[PDB]
Design a protein around this ligand. Structure first.
Ligand SMILES: Nc1ncnc2c1ncn2[C@@H]1O[C@H](COP(=O)(O)OP(=O)(O)OP(=O)(O)O)[C@@H](O)[C@H]1O
Ligand SMILES: [Mg+2]
Ligand SMILES: [Zn+2]
Lengths: 53, 271, 102, 24, 211
């Protein structure tokens, strides 16, 4: 099946996965997100993610 | 043969600069260089280590002042140290021996420098109280292993494996070049002197030490009358009277006999 | 026939004498190694220790503890820590890095 | 079978290549 | 005669005595050897780290558990080689690995601070030391002693069981005494909370202490 993708994008999502809350979608490939400690981060968007938040 | 599990030797003389420099720079990842020789494909030995002063860039290739090192090597080779630099080291206080994004690039230059330069990581603040945390690394499947040597070692620790061989770099087993001359020289640091071994401590303090256990022995004697009274053969729980009686006995007897023996010997020697 | 059993006697006397001769050396060597190990375990609980709150006993040798740093940790119990002193209200001291209960 | 827990993700033809890995 | 037949009697005693004396020392050495092995592995296991504490909420995928940690928020976490993921019910509370997160084990029965409110030793208070309140004793039993003893009666009325009890009135009139006496006789698990123990300090100390 998608074992090639399992060998690529599962490695791209190197564990563990943190969980936060988005606030800005300024760039189509960079957003700006919040997290648990309340800090704010301008971060890149990887293309496999849903275009919705 | 393309290098394998291999081995690295460090002089004791090199080691103490590794720790003294690290404990000097407790706020910073202080760094320096090693002199040694790639003696063969099976191992590399390092002899002598010189730290170098701070650079505002921290650990990096530009942390190396070419003027300072060149004259430092120049001074060292003049005074009998013609060895080249076989590797570089830097401190990681608060986290174990592993390579960060700057470190891998820093080392990647060193392999690009000659053939197989090796990095060394020291964590001087958790390297304490007899515990030492040092390891050596090199970048690129490691070539064909021919001995169980690396199989003997603990596999890459999780705090290093999280940044481990996925970054295509691997550990090299540390080893020490200490010799009988250095061994007894370092042992002579703590070797007892004659008057030190003949010190009679303090008789009043000895009574204080004696009471400090005899009072406890009164309680464990009562507590011994509890372990023997629960002889119903119940579940295991050594604790309370059983063990703690024996260690306290050991220290108490050896305290009294040695103090009396040394005093008795003192009674014989000095008249 | 009777020669073989006397020869076996001769073999076994010296064999068991050898056995005891190095068993006493092993006793002394293991005493030394034990003392080295226990001085290490005592070195563990030396001085630069964090403070936390004992939460619960996971097993006979490990427990959940609550550090004053805010986080709570799954932490090894030091064996010498004698159990009846422990209660969920017992303030405790932890090794700084391993966070082990000491 | 196992149930998805609202994890998203697009089909393969819509992502990756070397671009995402190099960017990250 | 008395060389082959004499040595295997006069000296066989000695070799057997020596074998037994060796056996006792062998047991004594084995004790110390197992003990030193124990202490060595003790030191070595005193070298990893606590890996903190987290709680599972969903097994979104095998090898990819959603967990919620104590101080911080939520993460995706894998499990050790035992990997018995389907054994993991949500809110079980679990022990992770230190870095790359990952999960170590499942931990025993969950609650730790929350355990403190459960009443270990029930008080000596007994209904025989309350006077007059017998009617109130029955009105508390109908919500306490009756439902835990007779859900069949509630079914035989088809009604839903009452949810709770509010003891109100003047201060110093026995509601505390009735609570203590109830702790002595319900014989179900009794837990008590001071009203001011809640909300307290830092966010979630209200959330956690109720949830
Ligand atoms: N019916 C009763 N029989 C015996 N003692 C009683 C009775 N009613 C109250 N008391 C006594 O009153 C004392 C005060 O506690 P009580 O339980 O009455 O307080 P309370 O109604 O809970 O009020 P507060 O909130 O002020 O503590 C107790 O020591 C209890 O023994
Ligand atoms: Mg009251
Ligand atoms: Zn570094």
């Amino acid at each position: 099946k998608q074992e090639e993708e399992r060998s690529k994008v599962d490695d791209l999502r190197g564990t563990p996965m943190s969980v936060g809350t988005l606030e800005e979608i300024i760039d189509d490939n960079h957003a700006i997100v919040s997290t648990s400690v309340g800090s704010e981060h301008y971060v890149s968007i990887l293309s496999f993610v849903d275009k919705d938040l | 043969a393309v290098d394998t599990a291999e081995q690295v030797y460090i002089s004791s003389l090199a080691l103490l600069k590794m720790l003294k420099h690290g404990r000097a720079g407790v706020p910073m990842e202080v760094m320096g260089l090693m002199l040694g020789e790639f003696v063969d494909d099976y191992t590399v030995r390092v002899i002598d280590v010189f730290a170098m002063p701070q650079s505002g860039t921290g650990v990096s290739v530009e942390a190396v002042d070419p003027v300072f090192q060149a004259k430092m090597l120049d001074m060292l080779k003049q005074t009998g140290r013609p060895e080249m630099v076989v590797g570089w080291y830097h401190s990681h206080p608060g986290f174990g021996c592993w390579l960060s994004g700057v470190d891998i690039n820093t080392q990647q230059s060193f392999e690009a420098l000659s053939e197989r330069a090796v990095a060394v990581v020291v964590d001087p603040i958790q390297s304490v109280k007899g515990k030492v945390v040092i390891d050596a690394f090199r970048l690129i499947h490691e070539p064909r292993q021919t001995t169980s040597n690396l199989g003997h070692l603990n596999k890459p620790s999780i705090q290093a494996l999280i940044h481990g061989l996925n970054r295509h770099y691997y550990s090299i087993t540390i080893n020490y070049r200490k010799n009988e001359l250095e061994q007894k020289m370092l042992l002579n640091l703590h070797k007892k002197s004659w008057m030190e071994g003949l010190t009679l401590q303090d008789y009043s303090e000895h009574c204080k030490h004696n009471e400090s256990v005899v009072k406890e022995m009164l309680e464990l004697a009562k507590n011994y009358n509890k372990a023997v009274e629960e002889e119903d053969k119940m579940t295991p729980e050594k604790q309370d009277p059983k063990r703690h009686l024996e260690e306290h006995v050991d220290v108490l007897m050896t305290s009294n006999i040695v103090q009396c023996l040394a005093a008795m010997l003192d009674t014989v020697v000095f008249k | 026939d009777l020669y073989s059993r006397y020869k076996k006697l001769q073999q076994e006397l010296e064999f068991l004498e050898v056995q005891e001769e190095y068993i006493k050396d092993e006793q002394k060597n293991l005493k030394k190694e034990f003392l080295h190990a226990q001085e290490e375990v005592k070195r563990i609980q030396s001085i630069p220790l964090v403070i936390g709150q004992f939460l619960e006993a996971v097993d006979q040798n490990t427990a959940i503890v609550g550090s004053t740093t805010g986080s709570n940790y799954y932490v090894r119990i030091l064996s010498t820590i004698d159990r009846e002193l422990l209660k969920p209200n017992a303030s405790v001291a932890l090794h700084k890095h391993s966070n082990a209960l000491v | 079978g196992i149930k998805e827990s609202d994890t998203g993700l697009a089909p393969p033809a819509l992502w990756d290549l070397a671009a995402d890995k190099q960017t990250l | 005669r008395q060389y082959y037949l004499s040595k295997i009697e006069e000296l066989q005693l000695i070799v057997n005595d020596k074998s037994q004396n060796l056996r006792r020392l062998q047991a004594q050495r084995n004790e110390l050897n197992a003990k030193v092995r124990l202490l060595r592995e003790e030191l070595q296991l005193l070298q990893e780290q606590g890996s903190y504490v987290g709680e599972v909420v969903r097994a979104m995928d095998k090898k990819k558990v959603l967990v919620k940690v104590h101080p911080e928020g939520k993460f995706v976490v894998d499990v050790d080689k035992n990997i018995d993921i389907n054994d993991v019910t949500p809110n079980c509370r679990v022990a992770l690995r230190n870095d790359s997160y990952t999960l170590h084990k499942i931990l025993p029965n969950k609650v730790p601070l929350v355990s403190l409110m459960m009443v270990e030793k029930v008080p000596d208070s007994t209904y025989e030391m309350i006077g007059g309140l017998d009617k109130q004793i029955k009105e508390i039993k109908e919500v306490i002693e009756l439902p835990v003893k007779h859900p069949e009666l509630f079914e035989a009325l088809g009604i839903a069981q009452p949810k709770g009890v509010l003891l109100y009135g003047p201060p110093g009139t026995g509601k505390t005494l009735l609570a203590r006496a109830v702790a002595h006789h319900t014989d179900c698990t009794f837990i008590r909370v001071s009203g001011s123990e809640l909300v307290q300090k830092f966010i979630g100390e209200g959330a956690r202490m109720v949830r």
